[model samples]
Target: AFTVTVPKDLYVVEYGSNMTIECKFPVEKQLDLAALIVYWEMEDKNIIQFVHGEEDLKVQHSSYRQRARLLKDQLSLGNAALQITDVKLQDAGVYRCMISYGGADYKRITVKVNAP
Candidate 1:
């Protein structure tokens, strides 16, 4: 097992722009990146998406589902960076990057979008 780290947890992403969130894990863990379930959520809300590889997401949360894309190429490297495109004002909130391996490896990222 390896300890997780968040170098930059909070960010300012302008509306109509994008922001990348990097959630790094330990190399010693020998994680099965493809087998685990990963996802994110607003601190006070329900599951925003089912972020495993790059294919599972909730369609009902249209705004979040439509604009969020995980960098699959980087997932194996522990760079679970979630890119949120064309951000909106409503997007300003504390989001959680959660990974369920043996237990849930989590981090809270506060995303603040600048109004135009």
Candidate 2:
């Protein structure tokens, strides 16, 4: 069975700063990039999705198009973190990270944004 782990379930970020939501899974060997599928969503809205080894921007929500991304280079090591740039208050919510290869697992993270 595969397990998805979130380093922290809640994150507080200052407005206008970049925020990273860390998620990890177990990889016994190098992942097959061509078969890996990963995606993140908030409030049922797709933030980003990676089909195979490349990003599928067509499925991403408009509001997150320029702000959300997965740490692609780190995926090989089981790092499935999501990074949101220039965070805004509207970005606060429960975000879910889902990974699919041969099986699937997901984790949810809550984000809070505060103004300095």
Candidate 3:
């Protein structure tokens, strides 16, 4: 009884360009993102995790250290968009966005990084 709000089913990012892999979904029963645990990841790579309005970066992967960030301000508004700076070729892959509260929920997106 849930849905994944994916505006771009497929995405292509130019090398060295800024890119955003949005991961916000509509909640049927109305949920508060601030109270839920949100995390965004790419394949098996850890992107970022937010718990109760706080970011738990300890679990973040080394490659994404300074290059990735989740839109913090948007979390409270139900937006879990992830932004990446200086997109690289290795960054192309499938990403998963998840929210945990009444158990857990998730969605995925396919992305491509190309040379400019």
Candidate 4:
């Protein structure tokens, strides 16, 4: 089982706003992040579906197609940081980062875009 240390696995980190949430995962040397299957989820669940190596981005229901990313190299260092750009009001909602191996680790970041 994995434990989340965030106030809410989700956050309301606003737009025109840049916030970095640190996801600490205790991983072993046996894991290879390159082969890890990861994707982003939204309130509508119709966004980019990235499955390592399948670059033909599959998105539905919104304009955000592959607007997210899973930094494999950095995450391998136990820091899974997700960076989203050009935040819009539509960007507001729950986001999750999942690690497929070593151990079950997940992090959620919510963005609430507010005009700066």
Please write out the lDDT profile of model 2 over residues 1-116, one tens digit for every residue: 87888999999999999888888988768888877888899998988788887877788899898888898778889998899899998899999899887789998899999976
**Of 1 and 3, which scores higher on lDDT?**
3
Instruction: Give the worst 10-residue stretch by lDDT in candidate 4.
Output: 46-55
Model 4 bad stretches (over 4 Å): 2-22, 46-55, 59-62, 103-107
List, residue by residue over 1-97, the lDDT tens digit for candidate 1.
Answer: 4445677888987778877787776543565755667676684544344444445454425667667776668666776677777888988898887
Each model's TM-score? 0.78, 0.92, 0.83, 0.62
Residue 43 error, candidate 2, Å:
0.8
lDDT minimum window of 10 residues, candidate 2: 48-57
Native-to-model Cα distance after best TM-score fit, residue 28 in candidate 3, in Å:
8.8
Best by lDDT: 2
Candidate 1 residue 74 C-alpha distance from true site, Å: 0.5
Q: What is the total number of backbone clashes in candidate 2? A: 0
TM-score of predicted model 2?
A: 0.92
lDDT of 3: 0.78
lDDT of 2: 0.87
Q: List the residue pairs that clash in candidate 3.
A: none
Identify the superior model by lDDT, candidate 3 or candidate 4.
Answer: 3
**RMSD in angstroms, all models?**
2.8, 1.2, 2.5, 3.7
lDDT of 3 by residue, 24-50 (tens): 655446566556787788878989787
lDDT of each: 0.69, 0.87, 0.78, 0.55
